[PDB]
């Protein structure tokens, strides 16, 4: 007495009723899935898996920053990590290893420069000490010399050459002191270069981790829509009675909203 049509163009997921079967109002007759829903959901799920792999990547790298060494490169076994291919895991671990290696090498280069500057500073300090001691010695010998001038116990020539020696010592000292100031400045700059590497690495990891979080959020919303559309529609008997004129026996075939799948009499 009443015709049964699908609310939307779909695929016959399950045929529960047979021809001539008696059903009550509310009994399930047919379950349908909307066309193209499973493929869409599959796509969204794939994207989710990828984004989560990336999330794992940047989490591991952040941890490696905190440890200055890589943690164990394994996926946690959570339900979103149930359909991961060997290729995806390999790609993940390779990416992690390569980024960590590059970071470490950059650090080591800047640290190398810094250490070179430190060694140079040590050398400069040694020279400064040397010529300060030399300067003072020549100055004292010269002072002893030049008032022997005023008691005419020494030649002017000896005085001139001692003054020459002292002057050279003092000039060398001044030069190396200036060099000390400059190298100290360069050491400061080198420290800032060394620190900048890890600073930027840490920042970039935080940024990417945030991005993956946002992406997981949006993809989750899209997945929610997909799951809402994909969930099987159930057709329940609007009245109790007999199933007649059933024109559906193939699971997996297409039915349209204009098609009468069966009638329930009366
Ligand atoms: Zn001379």
């Amino acid at each position: 007495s009443k015709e049964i049509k699908p609310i939307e163009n779909s695929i016959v997921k399950e045929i529960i009723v047979k021809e001539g079967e008696s059903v009550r109002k509310g009994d399930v007759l047919l379950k349908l899935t909307a066309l193209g829903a499973e493929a869409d959901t599959l796509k969204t799920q794939s994207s989710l898996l990828q984004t989560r792999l990336e999330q794992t990547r940047y989490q591991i790298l952040s941890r490696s920053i905190e440890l200055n060494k890589l943690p164990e490169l394994k996926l946690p076994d959570e339900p979103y990590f149930q359909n991961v291919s060997e290729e995806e895991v390999l790609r993940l671990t390779s990416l992690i290893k390569e980024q960590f290696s590059t970071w470490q090498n950059q650090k080591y280069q800047k640290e190398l420069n810094l250490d070179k500057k430190r060694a140079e500073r040590l050398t400069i300090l040694a020279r400064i000490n040397r010529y300060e001691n030399l300067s003072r010695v020549e100055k004292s010998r010269l002072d002893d010399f030049r008032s022997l001038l005023h008691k005419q116990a020494i030649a002017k020539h000896a005085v001139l050459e001692q003054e020459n020696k002292y002057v050279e010592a003092a000039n060398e000292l001044r030069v190396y002191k200036s060099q000390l100031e400059q190298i100290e400045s360069e050491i400061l700059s080198a420290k800032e270069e060394y620190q900048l590497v890890t600073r930027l690495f840490k920042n970039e990891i935080l940024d990417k981790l945030r991005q993956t979080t946002d992406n997981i959020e949006l993809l989750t919303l899209e997945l929610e829509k997909n799951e809402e559309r994909q969930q099987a529609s159930v057709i329940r008997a609007p009245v109790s009675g007999k199933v007649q004129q059933l024109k559906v026996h193939t699971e997996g075939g297409v039915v349209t909203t204009a098609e009468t799948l069966m009638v329930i009499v009366p």
Side-chain angles (χ1 to χ4, degrees), residues 19-21 242-246 261-265:
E19 178 83 31
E21 180 168 348
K242 262 155 40 184
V243 176
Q244 299 294 342
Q245 307 171 6
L246 180 64
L261 309 177
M262 73 199 76
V263 65
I264 305 307
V265 299

Side-chain angles (χ1 to χ4, degrees), residues 69-263:
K69 63 172 290 192
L70 282 179
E72 171 182 20
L73 293 187
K74 66 173 185 283
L75 286 174
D77 283 25
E78 298 155 327
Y80 38 81
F81 283 147
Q82 220 67 251
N83 298 130
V84 191
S85 63
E86 276 176 323
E87 20 277 298
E88 279 150 11
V89 172
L90 185 57
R91 168 178 84 221
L92 176 74
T93 57
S94 290
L95 266 178
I96 295 176
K97 291 176 196 181
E98 174 272 326
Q99 285 184 273
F100 178 82
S101 171
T102 55
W103 168 50
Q104 288 287 314
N105 285 323
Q106 287 177 6
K107 269 218 296 181
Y108 179 67
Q109 287 298 131
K110 291 305 171 289
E111 197 172 19
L112 214 43
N113 295 334
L114 178 56
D115 287 339
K116 167 187 176 62
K117 294 292 171 56
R118 293 207 251 260
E120 194 168 345
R121 167 175 178 281
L122 294 183
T123 300
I124 292 175
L125 282 178
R127 301 197 189 161
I128 288 173
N129 205 244
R130 184 194 309 162
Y131 279 96
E132 171 181 7
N133 287 334
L134 183 59
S135 181
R136 201 191 50 260
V137 165
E138 300 286 7
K139 182 64 172 66
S140 81
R141 170 112 161 186
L142 173 63
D143 275 333
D144 171 72
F145 271 1
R146 253 194 316 104
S147 49
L148 289 186
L149 172 156
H150 162 266
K151 300 171 170 70
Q152 301 168 328
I154 197 160
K156 150 180 194 170
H157 180 74
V159 170
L160 288 177
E161 190 69 37
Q162 181 60 37
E163 173 183 11
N164 157 49
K165 300 189 194 288
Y166 162 71
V167 163
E168 296 193 338
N171 287 332
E172 215 70 15
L173 174 65
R174 163 263 310 184
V175 169
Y176 285 119
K177 291 218 183 177
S178 165
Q179 286 193 358
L180 177 62
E181 183 177 2
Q182 188 174 351
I183 193 67
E184 204 66 53
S185 190
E186 297 184 3
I187 284 181
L188 177 140
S189 299
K191 264 178 60 180
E192 172 54 43
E193 266 182 7
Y194 170 80
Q195 279 162 18
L196 182 61
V197 174
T198 299
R199 187 185 304 138
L200 293 186
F201 190 52
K202 191 167 180 108
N203 196 65
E204 191 52 21
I205 287 180
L206 274 178
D207 294 7
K208 283 291 181 282
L209 198 57
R210 183 173 61 246
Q211 169 164 357
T212 55
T213 294
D214 297 351
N215 215 268
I216 283 165
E217 284 180 1
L218 287 172
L219 286 174
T220 294
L221 291 178
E222 194 63 39
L223 177 63
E224 286 175 15
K225 287 178 203 53
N226 292 149
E227 284 170 358
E228 186 278 335
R229 187 189 167 251
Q230 184 192 4
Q231 243 162 25
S233 174
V234 286
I235 289 80
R236 301 184 177 277
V239 293
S240 306
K242 262 155 40 184
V243 176
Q244 299 294 342
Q245 307 171 6
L246 180 64
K247 306 300 283 187
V248 171
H249 318 272
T250 185
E251 314 88 292
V254 180
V255 292
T256 300
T257 56
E259 268 179 296
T260 298
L261 309 177
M262 73 199 76
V263 65

Side-chain angles (χ1 to χ4, degrees), residues 19-74:
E19 178 83 31
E21 180 168 348
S22 304
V23 297
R24 299 204 146 279
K25 169 189 185 271
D27 284 349
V28 188
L29 309 166
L30 274 185
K31 290 180 179 175
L32 297 172
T33 47
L35 287 178
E38 285 186 5
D40 290 350
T41 296
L42 210 60
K43 292 174 185 179
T44 298
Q45 275 167 357
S46 171
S47 283
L48 268 170
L49 174 60
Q50 300 311 305
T51 307
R52 279 182 168 106
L53 286 176
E54 293 180 339
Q55 170 180 73
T56 289
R57 190 191 155 185
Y58 290 106
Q59 279 170 353
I60 288 179
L61 284 177
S62 63
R63 180 64 176 160
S64 81
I65 289 186
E66 320 163 11
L67 288 177
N68 205 42
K69 63 172 290 192
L70 282 179
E72 171 182 20
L73 293 187
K74 66 173 185 283

